Amino acid sequence: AVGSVFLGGPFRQLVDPRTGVMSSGDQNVFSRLIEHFESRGTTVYNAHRREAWGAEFLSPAEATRLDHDEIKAADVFVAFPGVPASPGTHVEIGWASGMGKPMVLLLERDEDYAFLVTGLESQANVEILRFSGTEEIVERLDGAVARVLGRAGEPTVI
């Protein structure tokens, strides 16, 4: 039973400047994943919900500290690197892989991602989950999380 997960992905890039929040459509995948884990007893750390989807942003300094500390606390790191790339999420991918965390990276099917992201497969404790929709993520995530977590602490190149 997975104790806790950190869920990362594009955020500021998805906030509508006119309303100051993410659209319901853009929130959907995050809320679905949050509920998915929490209903199974897994605590979820996630900036989007923490900062009310854009309405209660923290400062650069406070966001940085919290994201880093919650990634360090969480048993598993799950994140969308983003199309286009989320720069903040890529920093977090660095933090998590540098900590030797079990990681599931959620990559859009047929989209291009960076070499230092796809190259982490078999260099770190990482599973890539390519997806074409939210239901597919929900159906496959538990198996992926379980596989990486099963190898937690085992030595990697990183």
Residue numbers in the entry: 12 to 169
Q: Can you provide the manuscript's text about this entry?
A:
5-Hydroxymethylcytosine is then released via hydrolysis of the N-glycosidic bond of hmCMP by MilB. To a less extent, MilB can also directly hydrolyze CMP to ribose 5′-phosphate and cytosine, which is further processed by downstream enzymes in the mildiomycin biosynthesis pathway and is incorporated into the dehydroxymethyl mildiomycin as a minor component of the fermentation products of S. remofaciens. Although MilB belongs to the nucleoside 2′-deoxyribosyltransferase (NDT) family, it catalyzes the hydrolysis of hmCMP and CMP rather than hmdCMP or dCMP. In this study, we determined the crystal structures of wild-type (WT) MilB by itself to a resolution of 1.8 Å and its catalytically inactive E103A point mutant in complex with its natural substrate hmCMP to a resolution of 2.4 Å.
In the crystal, there is one molecule of MilB per asymmetric unit. However, a dimer is related by the crystallographic two-fold symmetry. The final model at 1.8 Å resolution contains residues 12–169 of MilB for each protomer (the full-length protein consists of 170 residues), which possesses an α/β-fold with a five-stranded flavodoxin-like parallel β-sheet with a standard order of 21345. The β-sheet is flanked on both sides by α-helices in an asymmetric manner. In the structure of MilB alone, Arg23 exists in an extended conformation. In the crystal structure of MilB by itself, Arg23 adopts a relaxed and open conformation, with its side chain completely stretched out. Its guanidinium group points outward, facing away from the active site of the hmCMP-binding pocket. By comparing the structure of MilB by itself with that of MilB-E103A in complex with hmCMP, it is found that Arg23 in the substrate-unbound MilB faces outward from the active site pocket and is about 5 Å away from the supposed binding site of the hydroxymethyl group, forming an ‘open’ conformation. When the substrate hmCMP is not bound to MilB, the conformation of Arg23 exists in the ‘open’ state.
